[PDB]
Amino acid sequence: AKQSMKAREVKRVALADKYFAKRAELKAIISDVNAASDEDRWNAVLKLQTLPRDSSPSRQRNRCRQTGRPHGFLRKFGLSRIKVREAAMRGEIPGLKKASW
Amino acid sequence: NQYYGTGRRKSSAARVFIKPGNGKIVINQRSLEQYFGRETARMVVRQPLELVDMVEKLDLYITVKGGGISGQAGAIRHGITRALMEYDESLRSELRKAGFVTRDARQVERKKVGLRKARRRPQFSKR
Amino acid sequence: GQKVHPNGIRLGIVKPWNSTWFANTKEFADNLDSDFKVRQYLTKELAKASVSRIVIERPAKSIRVTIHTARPGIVIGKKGEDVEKLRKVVADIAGVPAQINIAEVRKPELDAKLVADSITSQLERRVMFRRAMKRAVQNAMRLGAKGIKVEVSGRLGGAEIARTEWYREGRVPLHTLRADIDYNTSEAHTTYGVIGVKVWIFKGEI
Amino acid sequence: RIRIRLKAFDHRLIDQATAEIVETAKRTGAQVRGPIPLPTRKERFTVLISPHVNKDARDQYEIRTHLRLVDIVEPTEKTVDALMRLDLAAGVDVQISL
Amino acid sequence: RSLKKGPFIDLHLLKKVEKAVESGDKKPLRTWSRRSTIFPNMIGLTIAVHNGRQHVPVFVTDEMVGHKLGEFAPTRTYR
Amino acid sequence: PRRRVIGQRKILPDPKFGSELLAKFVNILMVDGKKSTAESIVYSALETLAQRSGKSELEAFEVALENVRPTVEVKSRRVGGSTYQVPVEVRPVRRNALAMRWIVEAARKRGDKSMALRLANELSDAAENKGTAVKKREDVHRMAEANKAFA
Amino acid sequence: ARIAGINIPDHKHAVIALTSIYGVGKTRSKAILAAAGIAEDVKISELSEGQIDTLRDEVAKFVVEGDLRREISMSIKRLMDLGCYRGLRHRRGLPVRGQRTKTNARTRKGPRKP
RNA sequence: AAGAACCUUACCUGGUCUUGACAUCCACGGAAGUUUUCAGAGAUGAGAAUGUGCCUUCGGGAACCGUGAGACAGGUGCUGC
RNA sequence: CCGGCCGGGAACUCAAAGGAGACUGCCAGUGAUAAACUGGAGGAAGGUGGGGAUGACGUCAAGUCAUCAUGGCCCUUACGACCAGGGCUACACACGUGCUACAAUGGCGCAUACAAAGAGAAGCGACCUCGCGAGAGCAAGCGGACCUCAUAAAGUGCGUCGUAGUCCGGAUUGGAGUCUGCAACUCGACUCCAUGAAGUCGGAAUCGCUAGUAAUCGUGGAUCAGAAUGCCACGGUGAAUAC
């Protein structure tokens, strides 16, 4: 779905692993209640804009890994609601069969 | 000799013990009165004990979990009639005649897809 | 479209799964995408080698591909080198240990993917569709099948409107759950469009 | 001492995955409790069915994850290597506590 | 109704406010930050906030301090 | 239904004293599946009925039930395009179940203080037949005896 | 029985009586009686007249009944003078907190007249 | 739509880019990367720093990056008649 | 230290496996000695036990070329690519589907009983301390029948309210906040304090349901940083009626 959008997502995956989870402690350590609440903390909201607009994991849209369908997602499979259906009917997901209880 | 009958009713599950003795009833170490015998349908547990003789003839140790207020009460009534195995061919003719050993399953239905709760279709509009 | 997929309803009863491995919910998506990469690649390269199904089983952080093909003489090649030349590029996209395992089928007109590819390949090269449709019925019924229904859908002859034509012999019960039905589907990208072949094979009662 | 717990998606494949680990342990060693059935974590996935509208029609699936225990009591040295490189029954993932 | 610790501004607004005070109030500013508050040193400035297709100039008063810059720019024009 | 002629449910009798009849009167008065709050209306409407009457427990409720109990009712049987009200005799099962309903309709109207006080006043006004529930019954008998020319 | 500008009910409990004052509800009125020392189960007429002025210097601690009105009218007329988003919503008669205006918002808009 | 503050996002206004955000092939450069400054709303536009490896035909590998040339990529553009 | 808390127990609930059970099989009557039907017995269950999955040939040139794949046409320094702000949340209006109500079988306050099903690792987050509260600090445990989410709510006991737009209603709004996130103005949820709107059962009309159903009461999940009255699941109470 719009090959730009599939490549626009894999930028946000790698560039978030580059900055945050190492420089995501720039908000955790320093936007924190201590005796450094005036000078250092105001340098934490300063440098967290020095990082790019991306790399925040709130910009992950978490798309389907085959079609890039942004909607109907399932975290268990990494697929949209359609490709989880076409693969389960084919016998691709182990254990997943129709339930009637 | 102490006897036993299980009984269950609508996602509840009792296990009725029974001894010949005085006519007291212990349910989950509460009294029969203060557990739910101060509440409505207090005597569906005493319904098999009304038809065949209770008066001071045998006591009833009960523990029960699952279900709700009237769900556990039906589980005991089915548990007493299975605990009444001492005089089975003298009891379970007329005890069957009044019901009381039919488990009476009738679970809650599962919610169906498209339906609002298992029968209730949402509000059809023609136009 | 109103019928259930005949394989997916029978995955617990008679038909097995194409993939067999346990994985917890952390890696289950990553372990499913790797299963899709080794499958669309291995169907691209073994396009002329008549593959019906491939079985992806994964024990102990290691892959074990199992290729069910009608012509394994292409897949082993000379000496078993093309066995190895597939095993190199599977370990790039699966996780470093690997085995592939050929498993021949000796009656190729009873696998539903091979019968579908037999009709798909002929519809590519402008054969008449009713001739290809019915010749896969007659060749399968004499070879021991208790039923076959084949079905083509699409332009089929350079027609303006698309229409579906299907031809069946034998007994093919689809609502019976003990009924072992071989069902698979291919499509034939002609120059008038896409034509969709699908084929049921009733093999036995239980 | 040996806590063997093992889980899989299929009940008739986890049976002899548990029966053979009893046959491996109880024969050359001793003192296994047995298969303890440990209720299945059924996980349902309700997804839509069409590539567009018709929210109403859906397919409902599940995975059933079966669980078992083994509970070998004593550190038998005939048994401590009966688990090593004798780990058959693929499709099953096994976890041990020491 | 937010943000317990640290009134929010973008740096390209802050590091431009410091330049517009000491050089003196000369000309309106082209800013794109509607998400930034109005620090008290911004009184007297003439910042123009991008409503989406314009930059409407808004001369900061003394009571426009707690609010944000985009609060004083209608993004949807209506009748 | 169309094919069925099916029977009815063995309801459970009243707990405090043996009556399958006013065990149905609880369920008619019961709204939203709250039975325990419906019973405490029914008992507290009976002792205040037994206070001013003297008839002991259910022999007071039985007198007040037969004065609202109808005998003939009308239902529209269409014959050949026409549509008119036809009187028919009520079945004896329906006969008092329709009587227990009309009390509850008369007792949910005429709101004085509380439902136990409301329903006790309608049982009392039915005993000497001057209330709303006997006003309902006479008009049902007014639907017959003028439109009794059809049978 | 006449603490601030109005407060005249009768045959009514003391906490429900104080809700008549513009500027005190149920939490503040339970704190007006907790600090003065009046049990909330008594009425106004039973409450002694020497204990009523104990309520008067207790309701002197909140902004009530005359000052709250022109502290609220002052802030709304303030916002309409900033020309903000919220000030324009008060000037047009539209919902302010960010509610739907396509279908609902008929409390703010008045009667559905046309 | 099993979930629009940014993202999603396809829309709008403005700011930029053209063998391109993503793919393959060729020729040249450069190990990949890591540290920060400055300008800008950012994209981008320069820097200043640091690192310079796994295999030797030693006109070279492979991995990745930059540049130019054309095949072409790209299209949530149209037709579900 | 009465907490299955502990020694010990494998009976019982339970948990998943493996089996038994229900077939008009027995009996009676009607029936063309047939199919079957009515009634009874035994039985946990009675005649497709309950519910679901399972959707015949085809119908509508039904829906989707914006999941994907695709014939043709068109763009290909642009209808492609990147970015910041904006919009999808606009609002004289009209309709659909919902939730909350209009109260006394009710509201509030105190006390107290009984669930099932799910989820959890950049996650679920006890105990303790602080804050009126949303929450914060600290720091165990748990990828789990054990650790957390998590106190079930209607119910019941006791007290008050006294039928008034009222102690009903919780709209709108002012102020002060919390949390997520780079960011909460456009445009988030929530908490506190104040505000106290329409509404007193609803025109013509019209919808759903026959049993653990309707109705009512809460709980969990998916998507998801946050953001449901929607959807999808779970158990509590529990009818009326079918001539």
Side-chain angles (χ1 to χ4, degrees), chain A residues 1-36 41-101, chain B, chain C, chain D, chain E, chain F, chain G:
Chain A
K2 290 187 77 65
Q3 292 292 109
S4 67
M5 304 300 293
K6 295 168 71 174
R8 196 184 298 176
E9 185 67 31
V10 73
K11 183 185 287 183
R12 292 186 179 95
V13 176
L15 189 145
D17 293 335
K18 176 163 68 179
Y19 294 100
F20 279 171
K22 182 69 175 177
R23 297 179 66 86
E25 68 182 3
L26 190 144
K27 67 177 183 179
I29 302 170
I30 313 170
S31 296
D32 181 76
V33 284
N34 58 359
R41 179 186 288 166
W42 184 253
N43 288 322
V45 304
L46 190 147
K47 292 180 183 180
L48 195 53
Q49 306 171 3
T50 305
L51 297 177
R53 181 62 65 89
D54 290 332
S55 70
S56 66
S58 299
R59 296 173 74 91
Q60 304 295 106
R61 185 53 188 166
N62 197 4
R63 293 177 185 267
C64 179
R65 293 182 183 181
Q66 293 180 358
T67 56
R69 176 75 181 275
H71 292 282
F73 188 75
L74 294 176
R75 193 181 301 273
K76 183 73 167 66
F77 303 101
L79 293 172
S80 177
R81 61 173 180 83
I82 299 170
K83 297 295 179 181
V84 72
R85 190 265 185 97
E86 183 66 29
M89 289 299 176
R90 190 178 296 116
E92 300 288 327
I93 298 102
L96 187 66
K97 68 183 179 69
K98 287 177 94 287
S100 64
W101 61 94
Chain B
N1 208 164
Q2 186 177 5
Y3 297 151
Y4 174 73
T6 300
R8 67 180 63 85
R9 175 77 175 93
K10 190 184 175 181
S11 176
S12 177
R15 43 96 65 85
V16 173
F17 287 102
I18 179 171
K19 290 169 67 177
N22 196 0
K24 67 181 182 181
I25 293 95
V26 175
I27 172 169
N28 292 114
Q29 289 88 21
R30 297 285 192 269
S31 174
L32 183 63
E33 186 69 28
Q34 70 183 356
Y35 192 80
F36 65 96
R38 291 179 67 190
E39 279 78 2
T40 62
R42 63 182 62 86
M43 61 182 69
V44 297
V45 297
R46 291 197 294 267
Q47 285 176 358
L49 297 178
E50 285 291 327
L51 272 74
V52 302
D53 289 331
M54 175 190 70
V55 178
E56 288 172 351
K57 298 295 290 183
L58 47 85
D59 57 355
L60 286 81
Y61 182 79
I62 302 163
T63 68
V64 53
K65 60 179 178 288
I69 297 300
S70 176
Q72 295 175 2
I76 297 164
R77 182 185 61 84
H78 193 266
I80 296 163
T81 63
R82 298 180 73 184
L84 291 173
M85 68 180 290
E86 56 183 3
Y87 293 158
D88 56 356
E89 293 296 326
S90 295
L91 291 173
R92 289 178 65 252
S93 296
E94 296 88 3
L95 188 58
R96 178 55 167 266
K97 188 176 78 173
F100 284 104
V101 304
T102 299
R103 184 259 187 264
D104 186 74
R106 55 181 182 177
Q107 303 295 110
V108 294
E109 297 184 1
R110 64 173 295 278
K111 179 184 180 295
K112 278 83 179 177
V113 61
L115 280 72
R116 202 167 73 241
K117 48 173 182 66
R119 296 291 174 90
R120 181 71 172 86
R121 299 281 184 177
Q123 189 62 40
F124 169 70
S125 179
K126 184 179 289 294
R127 68 183 60 88
Chain C
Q2 62 266 20
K3 299 177 181 66
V4 74
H5 194 276
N7 204 170
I9 191 64
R10 290 175 176 87
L11 291 172
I13 295 97
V14 173
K15 304 296 289 183
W17 287 269
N18 295 320
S19 179
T20 302
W21 40 266
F22 186 78
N24 214 174
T25 181
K26 183 176 76 72
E27 71 273 14
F28 190 83
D30 196 3
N31 208 4
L32 187 62
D33 195 5
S34 72
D35 197 358
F36 179 72
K37 297 295 182 67
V38 304
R39 193 177 298 273
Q40 62 89 25
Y41 175 74
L42 197 65
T43 309
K44 180 64 69 69
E45 186 170 0
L46 295 179
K48 300 291 182 68
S50 298
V51 61
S52 65
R53 63 181 292 168
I54 59 169
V55 172
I56 298 296
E57 292 178 351
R58 186 175 287 109
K61 288 177 69 177
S62 173
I63 197 61
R64 184 176 63 189
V65 184
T66 301
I67 297 169
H68 291 85
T69 181
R71 291 178 179 88
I74 304 169
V75 179
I76 56 171
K78 187 181 264 78
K79 182 65 177 67
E81 191 269 332
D82 292 333
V83 166
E84 296 177 355
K85 193 169 73 173
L86 291 173
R87 192 181 67 246
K88 298 298 291 182
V89 285
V90 167
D92 294 329
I93 54 173
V96 49
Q99 292 90 18
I100 69 167
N101 287 317
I102 62 166
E104 67 177 1
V105 54
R106 57 186 178 179
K107 290 181 180 180
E109 288 175 349
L110 295 177
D111 287 335
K113 183 63 176 179
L114 295 172
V115 175
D117 291 333
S118 178
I119 305 170
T120 295
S121 298
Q122 293 173 358
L123 286 177
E124 292 289 331
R125 59 175 184 266
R126 276 82 171 180
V127 84
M128 186 63 71
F129 67 99
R130 291 187 185 95
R131 302 292 296 168
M133 184 177 75
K134 193 177 180 181
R135 194 178 297 115
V137 176
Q138 296 177 358
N139 286 319
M141 289 299 291
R142 63 173 173 84
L143 195 142
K146 296 179 179 65
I148 182 168
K149 176 169 70 175
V150 302
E151 177 182 1
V152 293
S153 302
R155 296 283 294 276
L156 46 86
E160 289 292 331
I161 57 100
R163 64 185 180 179
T164 71
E165 296 188 2
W166 56 276
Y167 186 81
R168 62 175 174 85
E169 294 294 327
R171 184 179 70 190
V172 190
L174 276 74
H175 295 179
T176 303
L177 286 171
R178 60 178 66 189
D180 183 74
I181 289 174
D182 299 331
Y183 173 78
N184 206 349
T185 301
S186 66
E187 67 268 13
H189 290 91
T190 64
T191 189
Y192 286 101
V194 182
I195 295 171
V197 180
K198 54 179 67 175
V199 44
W200 294 263
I201 297 169
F202 181 74
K203 185 175 183 291
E205 286 82 2
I206 188 170
Chain D
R1 180 65 64 193
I2 304 168
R3 175 62 58 81
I4 299 171
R5 184 172 60 86
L6 54 94
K7 61 175 72 176
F9 296 118
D10 198 359
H11 68 279
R12 64 258 183 94
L13 192 143
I14 201 170
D15 285 334
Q16 75 272 17
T18 306
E20 292 175 355
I21 198 166
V22 173
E23 179 67 26
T24 307
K26 184 176 68 67
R27 182 180 61 84
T28 187
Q31 197 170 359
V32 57
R33 298 292 182 184
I36 300 166
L38 284 188
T40 300
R41 293 181 70 88
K42 297 178 181 179
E43 299 187 354
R44 292 174 174 89
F45 299 98
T46 301
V47 299
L48 290 176
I49 201 175
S50 66
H52 209 265
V53 75
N54 309 119
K55 186 72 168 297
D56 194 79
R58 286 179 179 87
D59 284 332
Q60 293 177 353
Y61 306 100
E62 68 185 1
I63 57 171
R64 292 184 182 179
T65 303
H66 307 87
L67 283 78
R68 295 292 176 271
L69 285 175
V70 170
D71 285 326
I72 301 169
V73 175
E74 58 187 2
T76 301
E77 296 294 323
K78 302 293 187 292
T79 312
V80 72
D81 296 335
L83 299 175
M84 293 179 70
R85 68 188 182 274
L86 297 171
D87 48 358
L88 299 174
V92 177
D93 183 72
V94 60
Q95 292 178 354
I96 48 95
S97 295
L98 279 74
Chain E
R1 277 83 58 86
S2 66
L3 195 65
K4 65 161 177 69
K5 295 298 177 68
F8 186 76
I9 39 92
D10 289 331
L11 287 175
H12 64 86
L13 186 72
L14 179 67
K15 296 177 75 68
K16 191 181 285 288
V17 160
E18 298 177 355
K19 191 178 75 68
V21 176
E22 63 187 2
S23 179
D25 185 77
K26 181 174 72 70
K27 289 297 288 184
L29 287 77
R30 298 291 188 189
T31 185
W32 281 267
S33 181
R34 308 184 80 251
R35 47 188 283 171
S36 62
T37 69
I38 310 171
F39 273 87
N41 54 7
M42 293 176 69
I43 299 170
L45 292 177
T46 56
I47 38 90
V49 182
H50 178 69
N51 60 357
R53 76 185 191 277
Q54 294 295 108
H55 287 83
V56 49
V58 278
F59 176 74
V60 179
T61 320
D62 188 74
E63 61 265 17
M64 295 194 283
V65 169
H67 301 90
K68 293 180 179 291
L69 297 185
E71 181 64 21
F72 310 106
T75 56
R76 285 183 294 271
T77 64
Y78 177 71
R79 290 184 188 266
Chain F
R2 192 67 71 111
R3 184 182 287 273
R4 301 290 188 271
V5 288
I6 43 91
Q8 67 184 359
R9 290 177 181 86
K10 297 290 185 182
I11 67 168
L12 194 65
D14 181 74
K16 187 175 181 178
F17 52 90
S19 176
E20 193 180 4
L21 189 144
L22 61 89
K24 182 64 68 71
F25 184 75
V26 174
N27 291 321
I28 291 172
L29 184 63
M30 178 182 70
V31 69
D32 292 330
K34 290 184 179 183
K35 191 172 183 180
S36 297
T37 68
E39 291 183 355
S40 296
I41 296 170
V42 169
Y43 298 118
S44 176
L46 258 59
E47 291 104 18
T48 59
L49 184 66
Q51 179 182 1
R52 69 186 72 187
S53 67
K55 303 294 292 297
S56 180
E57 291 180 355
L58 57 87
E59 59 187 4
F61 181 71
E62 184 70 26
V63 173
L65 191 63
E66 66 179 1
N67 291 319
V68 304
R69 188 179 295 172
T71 307
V72 289
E73 72 182 4
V74 293
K75 63 183 176 67
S76 180
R77 299 292 295 170
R78 297 187 73 253
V79 179
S82 178
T83 306
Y84 52 85
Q85 295 295 107
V86 177
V88 73
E89 293 89 4
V90 60
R91 298 295 298 163
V93 174
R94 180 176 171 83
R95 192 187 290 271
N96 58 3
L98 184 63
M100 289 183 285
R101 185 181 297 120
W102 285 345
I103 298 169
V104 179
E105 182 181 0
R108 286 175 184 172
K109 277 78 175 176
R110 191 187 177 183
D112 297 332
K113 292 292 184 181
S114 175
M115 194 66 200
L117 180 58
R118 282 192 291 266
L119 191 143
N121 292 318
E122 284 291 326
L123 292 175
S124 297
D125 289 332
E128 58 269 16
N129 62 13
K130 61 185 180 181
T132 304
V134 302
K135 182 71 175 178
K136 182 70 175 178
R137 179 186 58 83
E138 292 293 330
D139 292 331
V140 171
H141 292 169
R142 291 290 178 89
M143 289 296 107
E145 195 182 3
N147 218 168
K148 201 174 78 69
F150 303 109
Chain G
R2 294 173 296 172
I3 82 169
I6 39 166
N7 199 6
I8 312 171
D10 194 71
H11 302 289
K12 186 183 285 186
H13 294 283
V15 282
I16 298 99
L18 297 190
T19 62
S20 298
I21 296 169
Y22 184 84
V24 47
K26 184 172 68 66
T27 302
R28 181 73 183 175
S29 177
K30 283 174 70 175
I32 296 301
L33 274 75
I38 303 299
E40 58 188 0
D41 54 354
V42 300
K43 297 179 178 65
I44 297 298
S45 64
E46 186 67 28
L47 201 154
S48 179
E49 196 269 333
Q51 290 176 356
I52 298 175
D53 58 354
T54 305
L55 273 67
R56 289 186 181 93
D57 56 353
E58 179 62 32
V59 300
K61 299 176 178 66
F62 204 81
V63 176
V64 288
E65 177 67 30
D67 299 328
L68 184 63
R69 293 181 185 271
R70 63 178 63 89
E71 194 269 328
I72 290 170
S73 294
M74 188 183 74
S75 66
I76 291 170
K77 193 174 187 290
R78 180 180 64 88
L79 290 169
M80 294 187 286
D81 193 74
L82 275 79
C84 63
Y85 183 75
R86 294 174 62 189
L88 190 63
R89 309 294 283 170
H90 288 289
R91 283 185 288 176
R92 296 183 69 87
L94 288 170
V96 178
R97 305 287 183 88
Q99 287 91 15
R100 176 181 290 269
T101 321
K102 182 174 190 176
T103 301
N104 295 326
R106 191 62 53 183
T107 298
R108 187 72 172 168
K109 199 181 291 184
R112 186 183 291 114
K113 289 185 179 181

